Symmetry: C3
């Protein structure tokens, strides 16, 4: 359409949907309860992402926020996505290592704060304050990464899959705050169509890429 | 008041409240933990519905959405209701059959998508796109119905209650997308006071009717 | 800033943050899973409260609501806080007594209704109706207090800590509806800077005060 970034929202919509369908199919047959648990969280992730990608594509998930002397296009639908899919991704990890729910509770609530403060920042109309929220959200992200490495004898099946996925997580996830900082939500350094591409590549990799590594491994089974 | 559908929102408010009070009373005495679990989910359902019915009655849960060349009255409070009560109803079913949480996870997330996409559609200002969201929401509903029948040796107590409730669920729930399609959110075929009546009858049956069948059966006990 | 209540929002921000940091530090070392579970819920509470306090301080968590012939400043961010932290506080209590999840389900859903109806009332533009929602929210609160005393052989460690915390809860929590009634959301009896102070003292006591009593006791351990 009339938004130059439309193409990347369309690609992302498409990629998230085919990823959802693929994992849906693959999960057909599965009766292993544990595996059952990874399939559900892992298919749901790009399915949610599919709908929020679509909502951005169709314009619904877009709003204008005034700040720094301009009317800025903010895709808020990203935070509706992440709010659910980021804890679910952390859920895949906790289960994979069989995390005490006390740690799961810390991960999921730290995540909510991360995203919730992400969202507040996205929509705050006082230019400098946006970066205050970014910082707090970053701190929660840094806490989550802390736990990923430091908050955790696992079955050797689980170990190599866990370490890979954790590696993929820290590298991908750590990129989100940077893109946010220099893109349209932040200093306005990198234009919106480029930011959206960046987020499209991270989003598909962190959900569909992450999911293919998880789901093709017997780490997930009994 | 000045809205012809006021009477059905008042009736629904009333019926949901007396249903809540009745189940509250009935749950008095109960110490069976399992039964405890069905009473809580089952009383909470029309209690939430009570407040959202009230919010529509009082006008709070109503908003105007512009599309197809008119200003359309959309009761958004329905989705605030369903968002919580529909997974809770699916929760009553999963527990009753002792569903693996992997399936519960699939049901509850598919439900969120259903309602969440329902809501997006309700509020989208591009007339044709509303039906895109309707379709996606319908697909999630069809998936849920799939699991209800196909996603599941149960204690014979549970079986006859389960089958009845599942039957009631598929027939009632399948009616919601139709009403949405031809009523005010959709093609505008059936007027708002009639749609609201339809939704009032489905809502009370699916929550209070469903609940009386559940709660008068020993299916729920130990 | 230009809002006389700014000082109490700043104090509260500060106190909630240092409380979060303190509990974070204290939870360092902890490997007891159960204790793990109380630390996470208990640190998360003022961390959420910290961000919502900040959001009010910075003006984001503030909105104008028209009613009774004036434009009223309503801090909605309080309900975004309570929505998560009040069930979490009830969670600390249920676990401490090892509540059946059927009761936990009743507590947490009754809480959601309480806060959710609190919020509807806060934002309703029909002056008299606000007090209808207040009443319904109060009823849910009274139900929760009912369960706290009546909805529940515990390990004697847990007992004296439980009774104290429950006492602190009933007295603090019962004060919130009163402040709401006579303050700016309600009859407008007590000015906003005074209400905000009241809420700041309750909030810190119910979260940080409550948490210090909980976390310095071996009630939380194995
Ligand atoms: C737990 C544990 C963790 C707790 C996290 C603590 C942090 C909480 C922060 C939250 C604050 C919410 C912000 C939002 C409610 C306020 C919206 O205000 C905006 C501008 O003032 C409105 O913009 C105009 C439009 C904007 C739209 C933004 C809305 C988005 C909503 C996405 C969520 C969805 C929920 C699924 C619904 C179906
Ligand atoms: C950061 C603390 C540790 C956490 C708590 C404090 C948060 C405060 C925000 C951090 C910084 C804020 C700076 C805002 C900015 C420099 C002030 C605005 O001045 C310029 C003209 O008025 C901005 O105009 C527009 C010109 C530009 C486009 C402005 C871009 C702003 C940049 C902000 C960069 C923040 C990082 C460098 C944070 C890395 C740590
Ligand atoms: C955006 C990409 C980075 C582009 C560059 C890609 C080239 C490689 C750099 C990424 C790095 C990949 C990490 C490799 C892993 C291998 C480690 O396996 C170990 C097994 O115990 C894990 O231990 C401990 C694991 C340790 C590894 C954790 C990595 C750290 C986080 C890396 C920085 C982040 C990326 C910031 C991106 C930029 C846009 C700000
Ligand atoms: C999980 C697992 C499943 C994930 C589901 C994925 C689908 C997510 C979709 C969600 C999107 C949310 C839409 C909404 C936030 C955006 C509102 O925009 C409207 C028009 O642009 C605002 O209308 C003006 C007024 C409108 C009001 C609508 C708000 C309603 C909110 C009801 C929820 C309540 C939450 C309880 C609060 C106490
Ligand atoms: C459906 C796919 C399988 C899923 C993905 C594609 C979604 C696309 C929506 C399905 C259809 C959409 C048709 C919209 C409509 C015909 C186009 C509007 O043309 C008319 C004049 O402009 C509408 O005006 C107003 C006149 C009327 C009041 C218009 C009513 C519209 C009707 C839409 C009916 C949708 C169903 C029949 C879906 C059943 C499957
Ligand atoms: C069937 C499956 C997905 C169907 C894809 C369709 C392809 C449409 O491509 C363009 C043809 O004009 C529509 O974009 C024209 C511009 C506008 C965009 C409309 C296309 C999207 C709104 C639809 C993308 C996904 C759809 C699927 C909706 C329901 C589906 C999940 C059953
Ligand atoms: C709105 C109402 C339908 C009005 C009509 C009412 C008259 C009866 C039609 C509804 C049907 C009721 C189903 C009966 C049940 C009995 C089946 O018990 C079996 C025991 O194993 C269940 O197996 C498998 C169970 C199978 C039964 C599932 C039913 C299917 C869904 C039926 C269509 C839906 C209703 C669409 C309503 C319309 C407004 C679009
Ligand atoms: C379960 C079990 C329990 C079920 C509880 C039943 C009661 C449900 C009631 C809910 C209703 C939600 C009200 C809200 C969605 C509607 C907002 O309308 C306002 C005025 O009409 C908008 O004001 C303009 C601005 C206002 C802003 C208010 C938004 C606030 C949102 C805070 C929540 C956050 C969610 C974390 C996001 C990250
Ligand atoms: C309460 C039932 C048991 C529950 C269901 C019914 C809910 C109805 C609300 C309860 C009461 C409502 C009274 C509203 C008020 C008296 C009517 C307004 O008249 C005055 C001038 O018009 C208000 O103006 C402005 C002047 C003042 C500033 C008005 C303040 C209003 C006061 C409301 C006080 C409510 C309590 C006393 C509830 C205690 C129980
Ligand atoms: C006590 C129990 C419920 C009380 C019912 C009351 C009956 C009021 O009927 C009409 C008399 O004018 C009020 O509608 C007049 C038009 C307006 C509607 C006001 C009535 C509703 C706002 C109240 C409906 C439920 C109330 C209950 C609020 C708190 C209750 C749960 C303790
Ligand atoms: C705002 C404060 C109250 C200011 C006044 C402070 C002075 C003391 C009054 C509060 C009271 C404190 C309760 C003491 C406790 C001791 C009881 O221990 C018992 C051990 O089994 C608990 O059994 C059963 C426990 C029973 C105790 C429950 C108390 C009840 C609730 C008390 C009223 C509330 C406060 C309303 C405040 C006002 C602003 C409306
Ligand atoms: C059945 C399988 C293997 C995959 C099909 C699912 C559908 C979606 C695309 C699959 C690709 C996943 C790769 C994850 C990681 C990334 C680094 C990809 C970045 C995305 C950008 C475009 C790349 C091309 C593709 C269209 C596959
Ligand atoms: C104690 C018991 C049995 C019930 C009282 C609870 C209060 C609410 C009404 C109970 C009725 C439930 C029937 C569920 C299914 C439906 C098909 C009903 C459709 C509703 C429309 C009006 C019907 C009349 C009533 C006011 C009972
Ligand atoms: C390490 C410890 C003991 C505490 C430091 C955490 C930081 C925050 C303040 C701690 C105080 C908690 C008291 C809870 C109950 C209340 C009745 C307090 C009402 C608050 C108002 C101001 C009181 C002064 C303070 C700044 C401590
Ligand atoms: C879609 C899946 C991913 C995995 C999205 C992850 C997003 C982060 C980890 C986002 C982080 C942010 C931070 C740390 C700073 C404020 C802005 C963000 C919300 C983008
Ligand atoms: C209140 C309890 C019920 C049981 C409500 C159920 C609603 C559905 C199952 C609603 C479905 C929708 C779909 C499938 C299509 C888009 C519009 C709806 C949200 C009405
Ligand atoms: C921050 C922790 C607390 C413990 C906040 C508690 C708030 C209540 C228990 C709030 C109750 C309300 C009621 C009962 C009546 C309507 C208005 C309120 C939402 C303030």
């Amino acid at each position: 359409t009339g938004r130059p970034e439309w193409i990347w929202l369309a690609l992302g919509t498409a990629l998230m949907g085919l990823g959802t369908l693929y994992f849906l199919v693959k999960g057909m047959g599965v009766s292993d309860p544990d595996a059952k648990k990874f399939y559900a969280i892992t298919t749901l992730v790009p399915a949610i992402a599919f709908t929020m990608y679509l909502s951005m594509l169709l314009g619904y998930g877009l709003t204008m926020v005034p700040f720094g002397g301009e009317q800025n296009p903010i895709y808020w639908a990203r935070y509706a996505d992440w709010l659910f899919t980021t804890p679910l991704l952390l859920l895949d990890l906790a289960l994979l290592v069989d995390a005490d729910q006390g740690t799961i509770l810390a991960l999921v609530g730290a995540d909510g704060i991360m995203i919730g403060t992400g969202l507040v920042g996205a929509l705050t109309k006082v230019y400098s304050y946006r970066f205050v929220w970014w910082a707090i959200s970053t701190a929660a992200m840094l806490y989550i990464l802390y736990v990923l490495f430091f908050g955790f004898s696992m079955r050797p099946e689980v170990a190599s899959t866990f370490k890979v996925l954790r590696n993929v997580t820290v590298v991908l996830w750590s990129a989100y705050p940077v893109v946010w900082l220099i893109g349209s939500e932040g200093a306005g350094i990198v234009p919106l169509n480029i930011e959206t591409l960046l987020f499209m590549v991270l989003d598909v990799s962190a959900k569909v890429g992450f999911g293919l590594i998880l789901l093709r491994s017997r780490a997930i089974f009994g």
